[PDB]
Amino acid sequence: SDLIPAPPLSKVPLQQNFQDNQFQGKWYVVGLAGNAILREDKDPQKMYATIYELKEDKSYNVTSVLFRKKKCDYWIRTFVPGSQPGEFTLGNIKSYPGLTSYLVRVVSTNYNQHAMVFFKKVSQNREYFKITLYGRTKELTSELKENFIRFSKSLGLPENHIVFPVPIDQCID
Ligand SMILES: O=C(NCCN(CCNC(=O)c1cccc(O)c1O)CCNC(=O)c1cccc(=O)n1O)c1cccc(O)c1O
Ligand SMILES: [Cl-]
Ligand SMILES: [Fe+3]
Ligand code: NA
Ligand code: NA
């Protein structure tokens, strides 16, 4: 396993004043980048969606829905608030074999249109990270998408580690 290193959190911006309620709801993953993410033009990534529903006690209840093998699989987990508004950590961490650490950080969002969230995961002792271009709709402006490509590069990811999942209608509507 050769892997680009996770950047210093120092160079991963936080969205200052973070409104945890205005971020609730469905988000379409219009952009996906990471040191373990790789463009594959034979079988391009199908677009998927993540639903953030706020508990209860303010931890998010994060359900991801994605269309795989002619069905909808539901990846479900909890984000517990961390250091500061916009930062979270994975809840019930012991459920996941090999998993030592998981860190969520909301880089930027205007809540009703778009969002960039940074994730950093240490699993089986290897250190992964990814960035997510969240769209409230399935398509986004070139401005936002290129701005995301720039940020993804600012953290050492080359263009072939940056994908834009192709929109689908299965499971995600
Ligand atoms: O279940 C999923 N498949 C993960 C397959 N995978 C790709 C590489 N990951 C990555 O590149 C990656 C990098 C940073 C953060 C992530 O969540 C990542 O999946 C690695 C599998 N990951 C796990 O075992 C895992 C166990 C427990 C929580 C968790 O989130 N993950 O992923 C999955 C689906 C939708 C969104 C996710 O975020 C997922 O994780
Ligand atoms: Cl993924
Ligand atoms: Fe994950
Ligand atoms: Na390590
Ligand atoms: Na749904």
Swiss-Prot record:
Glycans are attached at residue 61. Induction: Expression is activated by the oncoprotein BCR-ABL; BCR-ABL misregulates expression via the JAK/STAT pathway and binding of STAT5A to the promoter. Induced by insulin. Keywords: Apoptosis, Cytoplasmic vesicle, Disulfide bond, Glycoprotein, Immunity, Innate immunity, Ion transport, Iron, Iron transport, Pyrrolidone carboxylic acid, Secreted, Signal, Transport. Gene3D superfamilies: 2.40.128.20. Pfam families: Lipocalin (PF00061). Iron-trafficking protein involved in multiple processes such as apoptosis, innate immunity and renal development. Binds iron through association with 2,3-dihydroxybenzoic acid (2,3-DHBA), a siderophore that shares structural similarities with bacterial enterobactin, and delivers or removes iron from the cell, depending on the context. Iron-bound form (holo-24p3) is internalized following binding to the SLC22A17 (24p3R) receptor, leading to release of iron and subsequent increase of intracellular iron concentration. This is Neutrophil gelatinase-associated lipocalin. It comes from Homo sapiens. The lineage of its organism: Eukaryota, Metazoa, Chordata, Craniata, Vertebrata.
